[PDB]
Specification:
binds xenon; homotetramer; 295 residues; urate oxidase activity (chains A, B, C, D); oxidoreductase (chains A, B, C, D); 8-stranded antiparallel beta sheet; purine metabolism (chains A, B, C, D); binds 8-azaxanthine; Uricase_CS (chains A, B, C, D); 12 strands; Urate Oxidase; globular; alpha+beta; two-stranded antiparallel ribbon; binds sodium ion
C-alpha cells in the first residue's frame, strides 16, 4: 500500500477581532470560523510513525491567532491568502495550504436612527465564505461565496412544459410559491502570489456586494420559468460585471410549499386562484445546480 | 395507579398564509409553526383503551389549517386565542387547550430603495412566539415572547466586586465583551374570553415592538455592571410602558469571549488594553434569569 | 417593580472522569453535561448593581470540576445531590441549588468477544438524566429520566374507534407502524438530605434499568390500541416495581409513516395488506403525554 | 456565457421498506434517505427556458418509491446501481445519474434474550452510505462508507516528537485520551454495468462488516503514535482483505479532552499521572485525512 493523498490541520477555529478608532471612538468587530489543512512531504508520519514532519495542529491554531493579531482580517480573501502563504513559506516540506473561512454577521445597531459606536446584532445566519488554496509554485486559487441567504416569493413563478411520462404526477402551474436558500460561489482567476492578491483588494468586497445585489434583484424581478432559468440569469450578470471572475456556481434547493385541499370540509375553497393557506414541506426538496463560465 | 395529568395533540404543524390586496397588488406572507395540546375528560383512553374520547391528532392538524383559512393569523395572540377557544367550545369533554405558536420572519425585500410587492427575505432566526392557555371557565392566559435575538457589544460592560473565596479564579474587569441571545417573555393579565382579547388587539404588535426596542436600546446604552443589572433595567421599562402586562421574564446566556495571551510569542501584547484578538467560547456559558413583576 | 423570581448559574459544563483500577488494569469513563442554577438572597445584584452577593458563574464552573475530583460521579442522582448540597451549605445567602445532569453513553467495546479494558463506543444518543433540586430546609427532590430512546415496530399497532366529526379525515386502522422517541421521567419521594440519598444509592441504577426494560418490553409486546394505552401500561409497571417513586411521566411523539398509493402507476399495489414502501414524515407529529401516580 | 456543468434532482427523499416472511412471521425493516441528481443534454432548460428536457424532480421522487417497491433495497450498492441505471436507460438525453444513499440503523430488539419478530431500536446515529455514479458508456463507480462511528480510548495514545518552533506551545505526551468520529470510505473498482454489480452482491455487506471490524480492533489495540499512524494501519488492512477495493479514505477529527489544573485549590493534584477529571473541548478540533491505494 501507498499514501495517495494526505492533508491534515485544524478545523472550527473561532476567531474574533476588534478594531478601535481612537479618533472617533467607533469600534468594528469581525468574527470568523477558520479551517487550515496542510499538504506536503508528510507521508512518513502515516507510514513510519515519523512525527518530525508534523507541524502540530495545536501550532496551526496558534498561528491563526498570531496572524490575525498582525494583519487585517478583512477582506477574508486577503486574510486567507496571507495565512496560506505563511505555511508554505515557513516550512520547507509543506507545499500546499488550504484555508476555509466562514464570516459571521455582526451588523452595527441603529439606535434612534443613529449608528451605535460599539453595539452589534446578528441579522441572519447568512455567511460570506472563502476557500483559498495556496500551492507552492502554482499561485493562489480563491473561491468566494455567499450562503444561507433564504428568500421567498409568493407569486411570479411558473413551472410548465416539462417531460410527462408514466412516472409523472406533477401538474403544470402558472402561479406558484418559490423559495430557496442561496449558495453562490465565484471563482477568481489564478493569482501569482500575495502581491497580486493585494493589488486587487478593493474588488473583493465590491464583487461580494454585486453578487448579493444581482441575486436579490433577479430573484425578485424575474417572472421565473424554472429555478434553472432564473439561476442562469443571475450567473450571467455576475460574469458580466467582474472580468476577473472565471466561473459562477449556484446550488439551490427548491423548498416546496404545497396547496391544501379543504373542499372535503363544507366545500371550502383553498386551491388554485383561491389558495391562501399552504403547507411548507421540510423534505424532500429539489436541488438544482449549475456552473456558468465564459464562451 | 391513577392518571394525575394528561395532555395530547399535534406538534410541529407548519403553516403559511398569504394575503393578496387586489387594489394595490401587494402580497403579505405569514409563516408559523403551531402546537396544540388538549386536556379534559380523556383518562379512559389511557386506562381502558377507550378511543371514543379522542379527537384524533390528525383532526387537530386539519382544524389548524381550517382555522387559518377562516380567520386572521395576525397578531398571533389573537389567532392562538381563536384556535384554543374553538376546541373547548366544540367538544364538551375538552376543558383546556394549550396553543404554542412560533412566528418566522419573512421581511419584505427593498429593491432599488422600493418595497417589493411579493418578495421576502428571512432576516435572522429571531422569532416572535405566543403561548395561549384557554381553560374552560377560567378565561385566556397569554404569554408573548421574542427569542433568538443575538447581540454583542465590544466595550461598556464591566464585572467586578463579586464574592471571592477559595473557589474563585475569575479576575475583576472594567472592560469586557458582552454577548447574549435574548429570550424575553411578557405575561398579560388574564382575559375573560375572546371578546376581551379582540378589544385589545392593537396592543399586541405595539407591545412586541416596545419590548424589542427597549431591549436593544438598553443593551446598547447601559454601562453594564452585570447581566443581572442590565436585564433588570430592561424589564422595569417594559412594565412601565404597558399596564396590561403583569410580569416580564428574561433568560440570558452569557456567551464568553476569552482574551488570548500571545506574550509567549515574541512578547506580543494581546491582553487588557492591548486585547484585539479573542477566542469565542462555545461552552460553558453563564445563564441568568429573572422575573420582574409589580410592587 | 420588584424581583418576583431569580436564578443564575453555569450551563453546558462538559465533564469527563476516568476511574483506573490498578489491580486489573481496567479503566471506566463517565462523561456528562452539567448545569447548576442558584437561588437565594441575590435580588440586589439585579436592582442595585450589588455584585457582593454573586458567586461568579465562573466559580460555579470551578466547583463542578473540584466536586467531580473529590466524589464519585455515579450514580448521577448522588453526584447531583452532593453538588447541590455544597452550594446551600457553603453560602449562607444561597437557599436553593438546581442541578441538571445529562449522562452520555460510553459503552465498553467487545473485541473478539472480550471486553476491552480501555476502549469505548458511543452506542446511540440515548441519555440518562437527572434533575436535583436542593432547597434549604425542604430536603432534596430528584427527578430521574431517560430520553432519546428511539424505537419502531412494523405491526401490532392499531388505531380505531376515535371521535369522527366534520373535521376528521383519518381512516381507522387495524395495522400500522408505530415509532417514537421515548422521554420517561420518574420522580422520587422527597429525601431529607444527603444521608438519606446515600442510603438509597443502589436503587438508582436498578430503577433506571427497570424503567428501560419495562419500556422496551411493553412496547415490543403490547398489541397497541393507541400510544395513550401503551404508555399507561409502561407507567403502571414502573410504579409497581419501585415503591420510592411517586409519579412516572411519559412524553412521546407519534412519528408518522404514511402509506404511498402507487396505483396510478401500472396498477401497482402498495396500500393496506400490500403496503411495503412508506414515506416517513418529518413533521407534523403527534405528541402524547401523561403523568401516572398512586391511587 | 456558457453552461460549463449542470446537475439537478431530488434530495432528502426518506424511504422505508418492510419485508414480511409469511413462513416465520419475522419482519425486517430498512430506512434510507436518498438523493438523485441527473446530468445530460439539459443546458437549454437553463439558457432558453426550455422545460421539455426536464424530468421533473417530483417524477424523480416517484421513481425512487416505484423502484424501491419493485427491487431489493439491500445491499445499498445494488439498489443505488439499479436506480441510477434506470435513469440513463429510460431517458435518451440523460447521460449520468448520481445516487447518494444514507442507511439508518433499525436493529432488531432482543426481549428476554430472544430476537423480536417486529420491533426495532435505533442503536446510534452511525450510518452506512453509498455514492453511486452511473455514467453512460463508462460503467458504474461506487464509493461505500461508514460515518458517525464515535469512539474513545482513555489511554494507549501518545503524541511526541513533532516539529517544535516559535509557534509551538503543545507539550509532548506519552499518555492521552484519543477520541474521534470515524468517516471511512472504500472505492470499488469500476463495474461495467448492472450485471457485474449483481455478480459481486455478497461482497458488499461482507466488506462493510470487515471495514467496521478492522476500524474498531485497530483503534482499540494500537498503541497509537498519532492519529496519522493509526489510521494508516486501518486502511492497509482493509486493502489487504478485499482485492476489488482500489482506495480507502479516512477522515478523522481529533476531539480534544484537556487536563484541568486544580493545584490553585488546596494543592489538588489533577495533572499527568494524577489526571482524573478532564474538560472535553467542543472546538477547535484536529482534522486528519488520508487516502491509501495500492503500490
Ligand atoms: O495525533 C495527532 N496528530 C496531529 O497531527 C496532532 N497535532 N496536534 N496534536 C496531534 N495529535
Ligand atoms: O395513537 C394515537 N393516538 C392518538 O391520539 C392519535 N391521533 N391520531 N393518530 C393517533 N394515534
Ligand atoms: O454578568 C455577569 N454575571 C455573573 O453572574 C457572572 N459570573 N461570572 N461572570 C459573570 N458576568
Ligand atoms: O423549478 C423547477 N425546476 C425543476 O426541475 C422542477 N422539477 N419539479 N418542480 C420543479 N421546479
Ligand atoms: Na514550503
Ligand atoms: Na368543552
Ligand atoms: Na445557604
Ligand atoms: Na440515456
Ligand atoms: Xe476575525
Ligand atoms: Xe431561483
Ligand atoms: Xe400562518
Ligand atoms: Xe444583558
Ligand atoms: Xe463526569
Ligand atoms: Xe408507545
Ligand atoms: Xe428503503
Ligand atoms: Xe485513530
Amino acid at each position: 500500500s501507498a499514501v495517495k493523498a494526505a492533508r491534515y490541520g485544524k478545523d472550527n477555529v473561532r476567531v474574533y477581532k476588534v478594531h478601535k478608532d481612537e479618533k472617533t471612538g467607533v469600534q468594528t468587530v469581525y468574527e470568523m470560523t477558520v479551517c487550515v489543512l496542510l499538504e506536503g512531504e508528510i507521508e512518513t508520519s502515516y507510514t513510519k510513525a515519523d512525527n518530525s514532519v508534523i507541524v502540530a495542529t495545536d501550532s496551526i491554531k496558534n498561528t491563526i491567532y498570531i496572524t490575525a493579531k498582525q494583519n487585517p482580517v478583512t477582506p477574508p480573501e486577503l486574510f486567507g491568502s496571507i495565512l496560506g502563504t505563511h505555511f508554505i513559506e515557513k516550512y520547507n516540506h509543506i507545499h500546499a495550504a488550504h484555508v476555509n473561512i466562514v464570516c459571521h454577521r455582526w451588523t452595527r445597531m441603529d439606535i434612534d436612527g443613529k449608528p451605535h459606536p460599539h453595539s452589534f446584532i446578528r441579522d441572519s445566519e447568512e455567511k460570506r465564505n472563502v476557500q483559498v488554496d495556496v500551492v507552492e509554485g502554482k499561485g493562489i486559487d480563491i473561491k468566494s461565496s455567499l450562503s444561507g441567504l433564504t428568500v421567498l416569493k409568493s407569486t411570479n413563478s411558473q413551472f410548465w412544459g416539462f417531460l410527462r411520462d408514466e412516472y409523472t404526477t406533477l401538474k403544470e402551474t402558472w402561479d406558484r410559491i418559490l423559495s430557496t436558500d442561496v449558495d453562490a460561489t465565484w471563482q477568481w482567476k489564478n493569482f501569482s502570489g500575495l502581491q497580486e492578491v493585494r493589488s486587487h483588494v478593493p474588488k473583493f468586497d465590491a464583487t461580494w456586494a454585486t453578487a448579493r445585489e444581482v441575486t436579490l434583484k433577479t430573484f425578485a424581478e424575474d417572472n421565473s420559468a424554472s429555478v434553472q432559468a432564473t439561476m442562469y440569469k443571475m450567473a450571467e450578470q455576475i460574469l458580466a460585471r467582474q472580468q476577473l471572475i472565471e466561473t459562477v456556481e449556484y446550488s439551490l434547493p427548491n423548498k416546496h410549499y404545497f396547496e391544501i385541499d379543504l373542499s372535503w370540509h363544507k366545500g371550502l375553497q383553498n386551491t388554485g386562484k383561491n389558495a391562501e393557506v399552504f403547507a411548507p414541506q421540510s423534505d424532500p426538496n429539489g436541488l438544482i445546480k449549475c456552473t456558468v463560465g465564459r464562451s
